[PDB]
Design an enzyme around this catalytic site. Structure first.
Site, PDB file in Angstrom:
ATOM      1  N   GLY A  17       0.395  -1.256  -0.268  1.00 12.59           N
ATOM      2  CA  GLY A  17      -0.388  -0.288   0.075  1.00 12.59           C
ATOM      3  C   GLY A  17       0.608   1.394  -0.367  1.00 12.59           C
ATOM      4  N   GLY A  19       0.782   5.621   0.412  1.00 10.16           N
ATOM      5  CA  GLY A  19       0.238   6.738   1.280  1.00 10.16           C
ATOM      6  C   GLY A  19       0.571   7.882   0.289  1.00 10.16           C
ATOM      7  CG  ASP A 129      -5.521   8.171   9.971  1.00 15.05           C
ATOM      8  OD1 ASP A 129      -6.229   8.712   9.263  1.00 15.05           O
ATOM      9  OD2 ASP A 129      -4.160   7.712   9.156  1.00 15.05           O
TER      10      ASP A 129
HETATM   11  C1  LIG Z   1      -2.334  -0.975   7.241  1.00 17.81           C
HETATM   12  O1  LIG Z   1      -1.952  -1.083   6.221  1.00 17.81           O
HETATM   13  C2  LIG Z   1      -0.910   0.647   5.959  1.00 17.81           C
HETATM   14  C3  LIG Z   1      -0.732   1.401   7.061  1.00 17.81           C
HETATM   15  C4  LIG Z   1      -0.145   2.333   6.042  1.00 17.81           C
HETATM   16  C5  LIG Z   1       0.016   2.634   4.343  1.00 17.81           C
HETATM   17 CL1  LIG Z   1       1.439   4.052   4.089  1.00 17.81          CL
HETATM   18  C6  LIG Z   1      -0.282   1.138   3.243  1.00 17.81           C
HETATM   19  C7  LIG Z   1      -1.084   0.063   4.327  1.00 17.81           C
HETATM   20  C8  LIG Z   1      -1.712  -1.148   3.591  1.00 17.81           C
HETATM   21  N1  LIG Z   1      -2.537  -0.147   2.104  1.00 17.81           N
HETATM   22  N2  LIG Z   1      -2.706  -1.314   2.124  1.00 17.81           N
HETATM   23  C9  LIG Z   1      -3.690  -1.312   0.754  1.00 17.81           C
HETATM   24  C10 LIG Z   1      -3.075  -2.128   2.660  1.00 17.81           C
HETATM   25  C11 LIG Z   1      -1.595  -1.722   3.516  1.00 17.81           C
HETATM   26  N3  LIG Z   1      -1.250  -2.668   4.735  1.00 17.81           N
HETATM   27  C12 LIG Z   1      -0.490  -4.230   4.695  1.00 17.81           C
HETATM   28  O2  LIG Z   1      -1.526  -5.281   3.639  1.00 17.81           O
HETATM   29  C13 LIG Z   1      -0.221  -5.620   5.209  1.00 17.81           C
HETATM   30  C14 LIG Z   1       0.438  -6.621   6.038  1.00 17.81           C
HETATM   31  N4  LIG Z   1       1.209  -5.813   7.194  1.00 17.81           N
HETATM   32  N5  LIG Z   1       0.506  -5.018   7.525  1.00 17.81           N
HETATM   33  C15 LIG Z   1       1.912  -4.640   8.631  1.00 17.81           C
HETATM   34  C16 LIG Z   1       1.856  -3.444   8.682  1.00 17.81           C
HETATM   35  C17 LIG Z   1       1.364  -2.414   8.049  1.00 17.81           C
HETATM   36  N6  LIG Z   1       0.498  -2.828   6.892  1.00 17.81           N
HETATM   37  C18 LIG Z   1       0.262  -4.265   6.405  1.00 17.81           C
END
Ligand SMILES: COc1ccc(Cl)cc1-c1nn(C)cc1NC(=O)c1cnn2cccnc12
Length: 280
Positions: A17, A19, A129
């Site tokens: 993901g 931002g 948030d």
């Molecule tokens: C909370 O998620 C985000 C936080 C910040 C940003 Cl910049 C992008 C994401 C994000 N966007 N998307 C679409 C998916 C994300 N994340 C995961 O899939 C993920 C899997 N394990 N994990 C552990 C810590 C944080 N994120 C993940």
């Protein structure tokens, strides 16, 4: 040091993901070099935001709860290393799993979000948030609060933190005090929780998102006047409608998150008891 990840062994796999200022990537920490190493989620900034990430790292390093994503370490410029949850966020998981996630599971997820949030508040922090995009799915039976990018400490014997840099704010999840005075209370996270519960109950449907629903209520033809129009709607007593198939008893709990004055809102503990009674 088990919390020190060497750059030479941290292999990028793919994006998870992104931002405006940061991104999360799937990496494998492979010191043996044979692809048997552990998969990890790595947060970094796009090429002072560096100072904010360092404060975010120190907040997460000291949080320990079954409904808060696990800190694993750092890669030193700095990268935050965390456990990898392959199901991603509720925003991507819920539209693809409506058959598996019934009302009983939606309310258990709501209890879990409340438990993680009540723990954060007991540590004297305000999230700022709380939305479905920031809740990760561990399994069909467990969720975790997965990001702390905007988290601030509230001063001892004070009720709120004032934020100066309010640029790129999630306004459709913000309580009236946040929008009008840039003041963030634990009761403001309760307001945000009400909006996240509405998202959970609609399975994160894009057409019935909090932004889409408020814009129908205020008009999508305002631009720079959007926030004033939103404040006026809330002052008038208008709120997001009951989700489809959501029982009245659940909606009434959601309405208790949206009392105009922060001091009148339900606590996270009162919400947990409310949901537990409906689950019995
Ligand atoms: C909370 O998620 C985000 C936080 C910040 C940003 Cl910049 C992008 C994401 C994000 N966007 N998307 C679409 C998916 C994300 N994340 C995961 O899939 C993920 C899997 N394990 N994990 C552990 C810590 C944080 N994120 C993940």
């Amino acid at each position: 040091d088990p919390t020190h990840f060497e750059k030479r062994f941290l292999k990028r796999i793919r994006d998870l993901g992104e931002g405006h200022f940061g991104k999360v990537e799937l990496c494998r920490y492979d010191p043996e070099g044979d692809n048997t190493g552990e998969q990890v989620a790595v947060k970094s900034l796009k090429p002072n935001h560096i100072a904010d990430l360092k404060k975010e790292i120190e907040i997460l390093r000291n949080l320990y709860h079954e409904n808060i994503v696990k800190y694993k370490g750092i890669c030193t410029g700095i990268k935050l290393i965390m456990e990898f949850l392959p199901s991603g966020s509720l925003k991507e998981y819920l539209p693809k799993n409506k058959n598996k996630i019934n009302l009983k599971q939606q309310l258990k997820y709501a209890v879990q979000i409340c438990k993680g949030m009540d723990y954060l508040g007991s540590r004297q922090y305000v999230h700022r948030d709380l939305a479905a995009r920031n809740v990760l799915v561990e399994s069909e039976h467990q969720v975790k609060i997965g990001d702390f990018g905007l988290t601030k400490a509230i001063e001892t014997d004070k009720e709120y933190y004032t934020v100066k840099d309010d640029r790129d704010s999630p306004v459709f999840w913000y309580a009236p005090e946040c929008l009008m005075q840039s003041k963030f209370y634990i009761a403001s996270d309760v307001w945000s929780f009400g909006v996240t519960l509405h998202e959970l109950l609609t399975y994160c449907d894009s057409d019935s998102s909090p932004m889409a629903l408020f814009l129908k209520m205020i008009g999508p033809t305002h631009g720079q006047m959007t926030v004033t129009r939103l404040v006026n709607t809330l002052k008038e007593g208008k709120r997001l409608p009951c989700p489809p198939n959501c029982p009245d008893e659940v909606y009434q709990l959601m309405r208790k998150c949206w009392e105009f004055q922060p001091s009148n809102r339900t606590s996270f503990q009162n919400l947990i008891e409310g949901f537990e009674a409906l689950l019995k």
